[PDB]
Amino acid sequence: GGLTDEAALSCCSDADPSTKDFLLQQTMLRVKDPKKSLDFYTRVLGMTLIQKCDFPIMKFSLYFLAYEDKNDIPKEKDEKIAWALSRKATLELTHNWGTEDDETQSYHNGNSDPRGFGHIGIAVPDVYSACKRFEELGVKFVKKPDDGKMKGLAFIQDPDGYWIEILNPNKMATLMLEHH
Amino acid sequence: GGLTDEAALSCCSDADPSTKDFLLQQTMLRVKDPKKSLDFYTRVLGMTLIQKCDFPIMKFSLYFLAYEDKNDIPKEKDEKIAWALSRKATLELTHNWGTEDDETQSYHNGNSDPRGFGHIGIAVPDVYSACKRFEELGVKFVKKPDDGKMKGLAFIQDPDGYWIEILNPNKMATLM
Ligand SMILES: Oc1cc(O)cc(/C=C/c2ccc(O)c(O)c2)c1
Ligand SMILES: Oc1cc(O)cc(/C=C/c2ccc(O)c(O)c2)c1
Ligand SMILES: [Zn+2]
Ligand SMILES: [Zn+2]
């Protein structure tokens, strides 16, 4: 089952010139409580809030998190928007006003029925170290580095239960135990 | 209301030094049919397949797609994986083998109950020209550039029904 390498490549086309400056700018998740979300993504994972927007008829706010240096963030409202939404690899967290105060409300993380979305993933230079810190800080784990067969790979959860892969690019080649 | 700006910022902490080289490397979506998915992300959206991984015991494959020049992919296999999984803003598409032939299976896009995930988003130089190309290619639209209040912002759907935003950053800088 599954495609061969060749069959997969036969389904691929070269990038049309019209697409040549496109970039993958954002991944959007719904959040129940932006206070807890901002504290997790900034304090625990070290991202930076680069932009926020509010839509009062709609009754929602948008928050833009990214691994960016806060010094590079423009001060002028208009320029900041242009800068923020032209960064690669942002996380857009949507808050529907009111969710934080409903005890039962929760978003679905995509990993139980009905499945779809699986996770976001953060490349780190040392999974083991980063995960000792997450433990120290009380983060919830789906999978700790040495649980199951894929070693030196972890999954944690944000305050909504969305899964975050924690990986080391250099270990991905050799995930499984080897020579042994 | 929700939070003021000042409040929101009050909830943010400075980066712990240990997190300084962290990067948002991937967003994983599961896909029914990798053939149609690969065709959509490469031909319609102009991404590149940078890594394919197969796990026959577990019966799934992973396809890493990114806006990268195909001439920068390493030739050697361990180097290519390290490079691919060190790129920012990749899309990981997971194919559980057999879904492509299953008439009743489909994945949920996160935008009907139960909701969670909403969309990925592509920044483009010009939303109107991008979407006119997308329409000529038969792409299915959830929101056309000028439908509703937010003009020059569009939403299309991939073969599984995931929503993809099409935005122009230089022009939200002339909107509220
Ligand atoms: O606990 C779990 C559950 C699951 O359903 C999948 C995995 C592994 C996925 C994976 C494997 C290799 C990668 O390079 C990658 O980014 C993701 C781990
Ligand atoms: O069809 C949908 C569903 C949804 O849940 C949200 C939106 C759009 C809101 C939005 C508005 C401005 C932005 O810059 C952005 O990235 C997203 C569109
Ligand atoms: Zn969005
Ligand atoms: Zn992953």
Side-chain angles (χ1 to χ4, degrees):
Chain A
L3 295 185
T4 55
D5 289 357
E6 299 100 322
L9 288 159
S10 298
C11 298
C12 296
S13 306
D14 292 299
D16 186 87
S18 61
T19 72
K20 73 180 175 72
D21 293 307
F22 290 8
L23 52 93
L24 178 55
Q25 193 285 317
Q26 56 175 246
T27 301
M28 191 286 255
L29 295 190
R30 291 182 191 70
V31 302
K32 174 186 205 166
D33 181 354
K35 307 178 300 294
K36 288 189 171 88
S37 298
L38 300 163
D39 172 65
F40 177 87
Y41 284 109
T42 61
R43 178 181 56 81
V44 175
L45 282 190
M47 295 183 80
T48 300
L49 181 69
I50 65 169
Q51 178 58 48
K52 175 182 179 281
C53 305
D54 301 301
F55 299 89
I57 296 303
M58 304 290 101
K59 282 201 214 305
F60 64 89
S61 298
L62 305 177
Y63 301 84
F64 287 94
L65 285 144
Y67 290 100
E68 290 292 338
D69 179 354
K70 45 223 307 173
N71 254 92
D72 302 356
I73 308 165
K75 313 280 269 145
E76 195 292 306
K77 150 177 72 52
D78 292 294
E79 188 44 31
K80 177 198 191 151
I81 297 162
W83 178 89
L85 276 43
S86 46
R87 306 310 95 200
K88 281 172 43 156
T90 80
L91 187 79
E92 183 197 342
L93 303 180
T94 291
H95 171 228
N96 293 317
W97 297 348
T99 55
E100 52 284 45
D101 286 320
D102 168 355
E103 303 70 47
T104 59
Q105 187 289 316
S106 90
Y107 291 121
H108 189 69
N109 65 16
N111 293 300
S112 54
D113 170 63
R115 286 195 249 290
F117 178 79
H119 49 263
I120 58 170
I122 314 287
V124 309
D126 179 355
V127 174
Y128 290 92
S129 181
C131 292
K132 303 302 290 182
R133 168 170 172 286
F134 296 151
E135 288 169 48
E136 299 305 303
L137 295 176
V139 171
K140 270 186 204 330
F141 284 80
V142 164
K143 175 192 182 312
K144 291 209 188 144
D146 282 354
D147 295 347
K149 268 186 98 167
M150 319 222 92
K151 305 293 186 197
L153 186 77
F155 289 78
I156 62 171
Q157 312 187 249
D158 88 352
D160 278 274
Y162 290 115
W163 295 18
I164 302 177
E165 191 168 297
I166 310 299
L167 61 127
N168 177 340
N170 289 326
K171 163 68 136 160
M172 290 327 252
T174 61
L175 273 167
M176 315 294 200
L177 309 169
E178 273 171 25
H179 328 277
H180 114 100
Chain B
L3 292 174
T4 58
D5 296 347
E6 289 68 16
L9 278 166
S10 83
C11 294
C12 295
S13 290
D14 288 346
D16 190 89
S18 74
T19 77
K20 59 187 195 155
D21 306 306
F22 290 11
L23 63 95
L24 194 46
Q25 197 280 318
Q26 61 181 234
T27 291
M28 193 271 262
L29 294 180
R30 302 168 177 70
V31 295
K32 187 165 187 63
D33 182 336
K35 284 195 190 212
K36 294 184 199 248
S37 296
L38 293 165
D39 176 73
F40 174 87
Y41 281 104
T42 66
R43 194 170 51 86
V44 176
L45 283 186
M47 299 181 86
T48 296
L49 183 67
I50 60 181
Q51 182 63 54
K52 175 177 175 288
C53 291
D54 301 288
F55 300 84
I57 296 163
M58 316 191 229
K59 303 182 209 257
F60 67 87
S61 304
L62 304 172
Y63 296 88
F64 294 90
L65 287 154
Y67 281 114
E68 298 279 349
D69 179 333
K70 56 168 196 184
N71 296 302
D72 296 331
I73 307 181
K75 329 271 194 60
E76 311 311 307
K77 313 184 153 150
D78 269 36
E79 230 190 359
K80 174 173 139 178
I81 296 162
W83 180 92
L85 274 286
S86 61
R87 297 315 83 190
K88 308 166 32 154
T90 77
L91 192 60
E92 179 197 348
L93 306 185
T94 301
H95 170 219
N96 301 309
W97 295 351
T99 59
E100 63 273 39
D101 308 308
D102 181 348
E103 185 71 35
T104 47
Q105 185 276 341
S106 59
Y107 291 115
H108 169 84
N109 79 1
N111 294 299
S112 70
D113 307 333
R115 293 174 225 270
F117 176 76
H119 56 261
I120 53 173
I122 310 286
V124 307
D126 191 310
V127 167
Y128 303 91
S129 73
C131 289
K132 164 189 271 193
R133 176 162 171 281
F134 294 151
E135 214 290 342
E136 290 158 14
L137 301 175
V139 166
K140 164 65 167 63
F141 281 81
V142 161
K143 181 225 180 286
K144 296 181 316 293
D146 281 5
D147 294 326
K149 196 195 83 79
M150 301 159 179
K151 305 298 183 194
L153 175 80
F155 288 82
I156 70 176
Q157 273 178 309
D158 83 342
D160 282 276
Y162 294 116
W163 295 2
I164 303 173
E165 179 186 315
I166 308 297
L167 60 133
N168 174 354
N170 297 320
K171 273 229 71 67
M172 328 265 311
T174 38
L175 140 87
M176 204 45 141

Short mmCIF file of all heavy atoms in Angstrom, two decimals, chain A residues 53-97:
data_model
loop_
_atom_site.label_atom_id
_atom_site.label_comp_id
_atom_site.label_asym_id
_atom_site.label_seq_id
_atom_site.Cartn_x
_atom_site.Cartn_y
_atom_site.Cartn_z
N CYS A 53 -5.66 41.61 16.28
CA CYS A 53 -6.73 42.29 15.60
C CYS A 53 -8.06 41.94 16.29
O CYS A 53 -8.30 40.82 16.77
CB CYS A 53 -6.82 41.83 14.14
SG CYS A 53 -5.35 41.95 13.07
N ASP A 54 -9.02 42.87 16.24
CA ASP A 54 -10.27 42.70 16.93
C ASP A 54 -11.43 43.02 15.99
O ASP A 54 -11.39 43.97 15.20
CB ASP A 54 -10.25 43.58 18.17
CG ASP A 54 -9.11 43.24 19.13
OD1 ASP A 54 -9.05 42.08 19.60
OD2 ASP A 54 -8.24 44.05 19.28
N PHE A 55 -12.49 42.22 16.07
CA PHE A 55 -13.58 42.40 15.12
C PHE A 55 -14.85 42.44 15.93
O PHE A 55 -15.38 41.36 16.27
CB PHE A 55 -13.62 41.28 14.09
CG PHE A 55 -12.33 41.23 13.29
CD1 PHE A 55 -11.25 40.48 13.73
CD2 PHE A 55 -12.21 41.96 12.10
CE1 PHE A 55 -10.07 40.46 13.01
CE2 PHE A 55 -11.04 41.93 11.38
CZ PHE A 55 -9.96 41.20 11.86
N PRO A 56 -15.31 43.65 16.37
CA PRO A 56 -16.34 43.72 17.41
C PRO A 56 -17.77 43.31 16.99
O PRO A 56 -18.55 42.82 17.83
CB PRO A 56 -16.21 45.14 17.98
CG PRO A 56 -14.93 45.66 17.35
CD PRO A 56 -14.76 44.96 16.03
N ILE A 57 -18.09 43.34 15.69
CA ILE A 57 -19.45 42.92 15.33
C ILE A 57 -19.45 41.41 15.34
O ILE A 57 -20.33 40.78 15.90
CB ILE A 57 -19.86 43.50 13.96
CG1 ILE A 57 -19.93 45.07 13.97
CG2 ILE A 57 -21.16 42.87 13.44
CD1 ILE A 57 -20.87 45.68 15.00
N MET A 58 -18.36 40.86 14.77
CA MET A 58 -18.05 39.44 14.71
C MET A 58 -17.83 38.85 16.11
O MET A 58 -18.17 37.71 16.34
CB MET A 58 -16.76 39.23 13.90
CG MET A 58 -16.72 39.79 12.48
SD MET A 58 -17.82 38.84 11.41
CE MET A 58 -19.17 40.02 11.44
N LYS A 59 -17.31 39.63 17.06
CA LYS A 59 -17.06 39.18 18.43
C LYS A 59 -15.93 38.15 18.45
O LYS A 59 -16.11 37.00 18.93
CB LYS A 59 -18.32 38.73 19.17
CG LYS A 59 -19.25 39.85 19.71
CD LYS A 59 -20.18 39.36 20.84
CE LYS A 59 -21.55 39.97 20.91
NZ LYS A 59 -21.47 41.42 20.98
N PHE A 60 -14.79 38.51 17.82
CA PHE A 60 -13.62 37.64 17.85
C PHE A 60 -12.41 38.53 17.80
O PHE A 60 -12.51 39.66 17.37
CB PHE A 60 -13.48 36.47 16.84
CG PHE A 60 -13.36 36.76 15.35
CD1 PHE A 60 -12.12 36.98 14.77
CD2 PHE A 60 -14.49 36.87 14.52
CE1 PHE A 60 -12.00 37.36 13.45
CE2 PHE A 60 -14.34 37.18 13.18
CZ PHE A 60 -13.08 37.41 12.65
N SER A 61 -11.27 37.97 18.22
CA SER A 61 -9.95 38.52 18.14
C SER A 61 -9.00 37.51 17.48
O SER A 61 -9.20 36.28 17.59
CB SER A 61 -9.50 38.88 19.53
OG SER A 61 -10.33 39.87 20.12
N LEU A 62 -7.93 38.02 16.85
CA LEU A 62 -6.95 37.19 16.19
C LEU A 62 -5.62 37.55 16.81
O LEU A 62 -5.36 38.73 17.11
CB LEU A 62 -6.91 37.44 14.68
CG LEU A 62 -8.21 37.31 13.91
CD1 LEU A 62 -7.89 37.67 12.45
CD2 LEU A 62 -8.85 35.96 14.00
N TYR A 63 -4.83 36.53 17.12
CA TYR A 63 -3.49 36.74 17.69
C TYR A 63 -2.45 36.03 16.81
O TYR A 63 -2.60 34.83 16.54
CB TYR A 63 -3.40 36.24 19.15
CG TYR A 63 -4.35 36.86 20.18
CD1 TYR A 63 -5.65 36.38 20.35
CD2 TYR A 63 -3.93 37.85 21.05
CE1 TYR A 63 -6.52 36.98 21.24
CE2 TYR A 63 -4.81 38.46 21.93
CZ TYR A 63 -6.09 38.00 22.05
OH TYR A 63 -6.95 38.54 22.93
N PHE A 64 -1.31 36.68 16.52
CA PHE A 64 -0.32 36.20 15.60
C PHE A 64 0.94 35.97 16.40
O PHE A 64 1.50 36.94 16.93
CB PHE A 64 -0.14 37.13 14.37
CG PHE A 64 -1.31 37.06 13.39
CD1 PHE A 64 -2.38 37.94 13.46
CD2 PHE A 64 -1.31 36.09 12.38
CE1 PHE A 64 -3.45 37.86 12.57
CE2 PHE A 64 -2.36 36.06 11.45
CZ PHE A 64 -3.40 36.96 11.51
N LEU A 65 1.34 34.69 16.52
CA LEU A 65 2.53 34.31 17.24
C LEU A 65 3.58 33.79 16.26
O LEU A 65 3.26 33.13 15.25
CB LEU A 65 2.18 33.29 18.30
CG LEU A 65 1.48 33.96 19.47
CD1 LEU A 65 0.48 33.15 20.04
CD2 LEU A 65 2.54 34.35 20.59
N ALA A 66 4.83 34.08 16.55
CA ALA A 66 5.88 33.69 15.64
C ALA A 66 7.24 33.75 16.32
O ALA A 66 7.41 34.43 17.32
CB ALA A 66 5.81 34.61 14.49
N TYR A 67 8.18 32.94 15.88
CA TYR A 67 9.55 33.06 16.38
C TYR A 67 10.18 34.23 15.64
O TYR A 67 10.79 34.05 14.58
CB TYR A 67 10.42 31.82 16.17
CG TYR A 67 9.95 30.69 17.07
CD1 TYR A 67 9.15 29.65 16.60
CD2 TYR A 67 10.29 30.69 18.42
CE1 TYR A 67 8.71 28.65 17.46
CE2 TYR A 67 9.84 29.71 19.27
CZ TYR A 67 9.07 28.66 18.79
OH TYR A 67 8.66 27.70 19.72
N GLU A 68 10.00 35.41 16.20
CA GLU A 68 10.51 36.63 15.60
C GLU A 68 11.11 37.49 16.73
O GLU A 68 10.59 37.48 17.81
CB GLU A 68 9.42 37.44 14.87
CG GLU A 68 8.87 36.86 13.57
CD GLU A 68 9.83 36.82 12.38
OE1 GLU A 68 10.82 37.59 12.36
OE2 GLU A 68 9.69 35.87 11.58
N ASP A 69 12.10 38.32 16.41
CA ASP A 69 12.70 39.21 17.38
C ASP A 69 11.78 40.43 17.55
O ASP A 69 11.42 41.14 16.61
CB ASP A 69 14.10 39.49 16.93
CG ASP A 69 14.83 40.43 17.86
OD1 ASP A 69 14.16 40.96 18.80
OD2 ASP A 69 16.04 40.64 17.62
N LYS A 70 11.36 40.69 18.78
CA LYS A 70 10.45 41.79 19.05
C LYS A 70 11.00 43.14 18.59
O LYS A 70 10.17 43.99 18.33
CB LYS A 70 10.05 41.92 20.52
CG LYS A 70 11.20 41.77 21.50
CD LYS A 70 10.72 40.89 22.65
CE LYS A 70 9.47 41.41 23.24
NZ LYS A 70 9.02 40.39 24.20
N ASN A 71 12.33 43.33 18.53
CA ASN A 71 12.92 44.58 18.01
C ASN A 71 12.54 44.89 16.56
O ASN A 71 12.56 46.06 16.16
CB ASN A 71 14.45 44.56 17.99
CG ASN A 71 15.02 45.41 19.10
OD1 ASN A 71 15.30 44.93 20.21
ND2 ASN A 71 15.12 46.71 18.83
N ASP A 72 12.30 43.85 15.75
CA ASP A 72 12.01 43.97 14.32
C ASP A 72 10.53 44.26 14.12
O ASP A 72 10.05 44.42 13.01
CB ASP A 72 12.36 42.69 13.58
CG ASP A 72 13.83 42.29 13.72
OD1 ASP A 72 14.58 43.04 14.33
OD2 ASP A 72 14.19 41.21 13.35
N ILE A 73 9.76 44.28 15.19
CA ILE A 73 8.35 44.52 14.98
C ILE A 73 8.14 46.02 14.72
O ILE A 73 8.34 46.79 15.62
CB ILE A 73 7.48 44.07 16.15
CG1 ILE A 73 7.74 42.60 16.57
CG2 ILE A 73 6.03 44.36 15.75
CD1 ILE A 73 7.17 42.24 17.93
N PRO A 74 7.56 46.47 13.59
CA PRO A 74 7.31 47.90 13.37
C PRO A 74 6.34 48.52 14.37
O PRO A 74 5.34 47.88 14.67
CB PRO A 74 6.68 47.86 11.88
CG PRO A 74 7.32 46.63 11.25
CD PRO A 74 7.12 45.64 12.45
N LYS A 75 6.52 49.80 14.75
CA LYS A 75 5.61 50.43 15.70
C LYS A 75 4.34 50.96 15.04
O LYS A 75 3.32 51.02 15.72
CB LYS A 75 6.24 51.48 16.63
CG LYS A 75 7.57 51.01 17.27
CD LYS A 75 7.45 50.08 18.48
CE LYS A 75 7.42 50.88 19.74
NZ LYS A 75 6.55 50.25 20.74
N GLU A 76 4.39 51.33 13.75
CA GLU A 76 3.24 51.96 13.13
C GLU A 76 2.23 50.85 12.78
O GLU A 76 2.60 49.85 12.15
CB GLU A 76 3.75 52.87 12.01
CG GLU A 76 2.71 53.87 11.51
CD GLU A 76 1.53 53.23 10.75
OE1 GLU A 76 1.78 52.47 9.78
OE2 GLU A 76 0.35 53.45 11.13
N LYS A 77 1.01 50.99 13.29
CA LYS A 77 -0.12 50.09 13.08
C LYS A 77 -0.06 49.47 11.67
O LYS A 77 -0.12 48.26 11.54
CB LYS A 77 -1.42 50.86 13.37
CG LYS A 77 -2.67 50.44 12.59
CD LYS A 77 -3.99 51.16 12.93
CE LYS A 77 -4.12 52.61 12.48
NZ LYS A 77 -3.82 52.83 11.06
N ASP A 78 0.09 50.29 10.62
CA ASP A 78 -0.13 49.82 9.27
C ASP A 78 1.03 48.96 8.85
O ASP A 78 0.80 47.88 8.27
CB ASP A 78 -0.18 50.94 8.25
CG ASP A 78 -1.38 51.87 8.38
OD1 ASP A 78 -2.50 51.36 8.13
OD2 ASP A 78 -1.17 53.07 8.68
N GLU A 79 2.25 49.45 9.13
CA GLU A 79 3.42 48.73 8.76
C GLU A 79 3.51 47.37 9.48
O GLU A 79 3.93 46.39 8.87
CB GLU A 79 4.70 49.52 9.00
CG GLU A 79 5.90 48.78 8.39
CD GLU A 79 5.78 48.15 6.99
OE1 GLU A 79 5.04 48.67 6.11
OE2 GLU A 79 6.55 47.16 6.77
N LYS A 80 3.09 47.33 10.77
CA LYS A 80 3.20 46.14 11.60
C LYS A 80 2.36 45.03 10.99
O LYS A 80 2.80 43.90 11.00
CB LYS A 80 2.81 46.55 13.03
CG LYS A 80 2.76 45.52 14.13
CD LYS A 80 1.91 46.12 15.26
CE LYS A 80 2.02 45.32 16.50
NZ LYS A 80 1.84 46.08 17.75
N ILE A 81 1.12 45.33 10.59
CA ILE A 81 0.25 44.37 9.92
C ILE A 81 0.94 43.77 8.70
O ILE A 81 0.89 42.54 8.54
CB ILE A 81 -1.14 44.96 9.57
CG1 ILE A 81 -1.87 45.34 10.87
CG2 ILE A 81 -1.98 43.97 8.79
CD1 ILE A 81 -3.04 46.32 10.74
N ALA A 82 1.55 44.63 7.86
CA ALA A 82 2.17 44.22 6.64
C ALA A 82 3.34 43.34 6.98
O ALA A 82 3.59 42.36 6.28
CB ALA A 82 2.64 45.41 5.77
N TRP A 83 4.09 43.73 8.02
CA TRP A 83 5.24 42.93 8.41
C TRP A 83 4.80 41.58 8.97
O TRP A 83 5.27 40.55 8.46
CB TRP A 83 6.09 43.70 9.41
CG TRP A 83 7.26 42.92 9.90
CD1 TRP A 83 8.51 42.88 9.33
CD2 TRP A 83 7.34 42.18 11.13
NE1 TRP A 83 9.31 42.03 10.05
CE2 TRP A 83 8.65 41.64 11.19
CE3 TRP A 83 6.44 41.95 12.17
CZ2 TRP A 83 9.11 40.88 12.27
CZ3 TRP A 83 6.88 41.18 13.21
CH2 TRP A 83 8.20 40.72 13.29
N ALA A 84 3.86 41.60 9.92
CA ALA A 84 3.44 40.37 10.60
C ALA A 84 2.92 39.33 9.63
O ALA A 84 3.35 38.20 9.77
CB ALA A 84 2.41 40.57 11.65
N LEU A 85 2.03 39.72 8.69
CA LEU A 85 1.35 38.82 7.79
C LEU A 85 2.20 38.47 6.57
O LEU A 85 1.71 37.70 5.75
CB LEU A 85 0.00 39.41 7.35
CG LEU A 85 -1.18 39.18 8.29
CD1 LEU A 85 -0.89 39.39 9.72
CD2 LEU A 85 -2.22 40.18 7.90
N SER A 86 3.45 38.98 6.50
CA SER A 86 4.45 38.60 5.51
C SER A 86 5.54 37.76 6.16
O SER A 86 6.34 37.29 5.41
CB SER A 86 5.10 39.76 4.70
OG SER A 86 5.46 40.80 5.56
N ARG A 87 5.47 37.47 7.51
CA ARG A 87 6.33 36.45 8.11
C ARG A 87 5.89 35.02 7.75
O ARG A 87 4.72 34.72 7.59
CB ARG A 87 6.34 36.52 9.65
CG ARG A 87 6.69 37.87 10.19
CD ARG A 87 7.97 38.44 9.55
NE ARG A 87 7.72 39.33 8.42
CZ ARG A 87 8.66 39.60 7.53
NH1 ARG A 87 9.92 39.45 7.80
NH2 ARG A 87 8.29 40.05 6.36
N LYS A 88 6.87 34.16 7.57
CA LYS A 88 6.66 32.74 7.38
C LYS A 88 6.34 32.12 8.73
O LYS A 88 6.79 32.64 9.74
CB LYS A 88 7.96 32.03 6.91
CG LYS A 88 8.14 32.26 5.41
CD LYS A 88 9.44 31.82 4.76
CE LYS A 88 9.76 30.51 5.29
NZ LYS A 88 10.63 29.88 4.30
N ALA A 89 5.55 31.03 8.70
CA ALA A 89 5.47 30.15 9.85
C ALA A 89 4.92 30.85 11.10
O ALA A 89 5.54 30.77 12.19
CB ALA A 89 6.84 29.59 10.10
N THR A 90 3.80 31.57 10.94
CA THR A 90 3.09 32.17 12.04
C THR A 90 1.99 31.22 12.49
O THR A 90 1.49 30.38 11.71
CB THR A 90 2.56 33.59 11.76
OG1 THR A 90 1.36 33.55 11.00
CG2 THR A 90 3.57 34.51 11.13
N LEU A 91 1.58 31.42 13.76
CA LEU A 91 0.43 30.76 14.35
C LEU A 91 -0.65 31.78 14.66
O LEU A 91 -0.39 32.76 15.33
CB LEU A 91 0.98 30.09 15.58
CG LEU A 91 0.01 29.17 16.31
CD1 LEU A 91 -0.03 27.84 15.53
CD2 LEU A 91 0.62 28.91 17.69
N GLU A 92 -1.81 31.65 14.03
CA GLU A 92 -2.94 32.55 14.18
C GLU A 92 -3.90 31.85 15.16
O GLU A 92 -4.34 30.71 14.90
CB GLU A 92 -3.65 32.77 12.84
CG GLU A 92 -4.80 33.77 12.93
CD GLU A 92 -5.71 33.68 11.76
OE1 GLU A 92 -5.14 33.10 10.84
OE2 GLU A 92 -6.89 34.08 11.74
N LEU A 93 -4.16 32.45 16.32
CA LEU A 93 -5.03 31.84 17.33
C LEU A 93 -6.30 32.65 17.35
O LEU A 93 -6.24 33.88 17.41
CB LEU A 93 -4.31 31.87 18.68
CG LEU A 93 -2.95 31.18 18.74
CD1 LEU A 93 -2.50 31.37 20.17
CD2 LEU A 93 -3.10 29.72 18.33
N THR A 94 -7.46 31.98 17.12
CA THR A 94 -8.69 32.72 17.02
C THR A 94 -9.42 32.58 18.35
O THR A 94 -9.77 31.46 18.73
CB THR A 94 -9.53 32.14 15.86
OG1 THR A 94 -8.85 32.47 14.65
CG2 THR A 94 -10.87 32.85 15.77
N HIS A 95 -9.81 33.71 18.97
CA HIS A 95 -10.66 33.66 20.15
C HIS A 95 -12.05 34.21 19.85
O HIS A 95 -12.15 35.38 19.50
CB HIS A 95 -9.97 34.45 21.24
CG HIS A 95 -10.79 34.69 22.46
ND1 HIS A 95 -10.87 35.95 23.03
CD2 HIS A 95 -11.46 33.88 23.25
CE1 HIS A 95 -11.67 35.89 24.08
NE2 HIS A 95 -11.99 34.64 24.26
N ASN A 96 -13.07 33.37 19.99
CA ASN A 96 -14.46 33.77 19.93
C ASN A 96 -14.79 34.26 21.34
O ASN A 96 -14.61 33.54 22.33
CB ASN A 96 -15.33 32.61 19.45
CG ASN A 96 -15.09 32.20 18.00
OD1 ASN A 96 -14.94 33.01 17.09
ND2 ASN A 96 -14.96 30.91 17.76
N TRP A 97 -15.19 35.53 21.46
CA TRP A 97 -15.31 36.17 22.77
C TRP A 97 -16.35 35.45 23.59
O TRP A 97 -17.38 35.09 23.03
CB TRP A 97 -15.73 37.62 22.61
CG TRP A 97 -14.76 38.48 21.88
CD1 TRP A 97 -13.47 38.18 21.53
CD2 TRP A 97 -15.00 39.83 21.50
NE1 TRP A 97 -12.88 39.27 20.97
CE2 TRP A 97 -13.80 40.29 20.92
CE3 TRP A 97 -16.12 40.68 21.60
CZ2 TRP A 97 -13.66 41.57 20.42
CZ3 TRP A 97 -15.99 41.95 21.07
CH2 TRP A 97 -14.75 42.40 20.54
#
